[PDB]
Amino acid sequence: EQNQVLNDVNNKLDAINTMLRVYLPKLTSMLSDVMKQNYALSLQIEYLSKQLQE
Amino acid sequence: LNDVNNKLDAINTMLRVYLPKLTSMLSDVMKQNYALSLQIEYLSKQLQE
């Protein structure tokens, strides 16, 4: 019984951990893209400020 | 070993529940940033007029 319950632990944890491995890089890339988009918005607002100065 | 099993399974199902929420939240944040970009383009058109 001990060996089979340990096998169950093994498979459960390995599956969930590979799911986490798949997930995390997606979040990292999403945050990087969000920061890039915020920088783009900053540039747009600087252009707006130049327009207002003109 | 049973204690290890239950602890790790519980925490791992918690992580499973959590992560998709973060993914959806980031997608919605990016969509909202795109909406802000469109609003600012409309502002620029107003300023050109």
Numbering used by the authors:
A (entry chain B): 95 to 148
B (entry chain A): 100 to 148
Sentences from the study reporting this entry:
In addition, Bt secretes to the medium numerous vegetative insecticidal proteins (Vip) that have been classified into three different families. Notably, members of the Vip3 family have shown to have a broad-spectrum activity against Lepidoptera4 and, since they target binding sites different to those of Cry proteins in the insect membranes, they are considered a good complement to the action of these toxins. Vip3 proteins are synthesized in an inactive state, as protoxins, and they require to be activated by proteases present in the midgut tract of the insect. To shed light on some of these questions, we have determined the near-atomic resolution structures of Vip3Aa in the protoxin and activated states by cryo-electron microscopy (cryo-EM).
We therefore decided to solve the three-dimensional structure of Vip3Aa after trypsin treatment. Activated Vip3Aa shows the same domain organization described in the protoxin state, and domains II–V maintain a similar global architecture. Domain I, however, suffers a large conformational change that remodels the apex of the pyramid into a ~200 Å-long needle. In particular, three antiparallel N-terminal helices (α2–α4) undergo a set of rotations, in a manner akin to a folding cane, to form a long continuous helix that assembles into a parallel four-helical coiled-coil in the digested Vip3Aa tetramer. The cryo-EM analysis shows that the coiled-coil is relatively ordered starting at the beginning of α2 (~D45), and that the flexible end is formed by the most N-terminal region of the protein, which contain the residues forming the first alpha helix in the protoxin state. Close examination of the structure of the toxin revealed that the coiled-coil of Vip3A, which resembles other four-helix bundles such as the SNARE complex (RMSD of 3.4 Å for 232 residues), extends ~160 Å and that the average internal radius of the modeled section was 1.46 Å. Interestingly, comparative analysis of different structures, like that of the Sendai virus P protein, have shown that hydrophilic residues found in these positions—known as N@d layers—can bind ions and water molecules in the central cavity of the tetrameric coiled-coil. Although the resolution of the cryo-EM reconstruction does not allow visualization of water molecules, there is a clear peak of density coordinated by four symmetry related asparagines (N163) that, based on the buffer composition (5 mM MgCl2), was assigned to a magnesium ion. Domain I is indeed retained after protease digestion and stays tightly bound to the core of the protein through interactions with domain II, forming an essential part of the active toxin. Notably, the coiled-coil observed upon trypsin digestion forms a 160 Å-long dipole that can accommodate small ions in the inner cavity and, therefore, the dimension of this four-helix needle would be sufficient to reach and pierce the lipid bilayer.
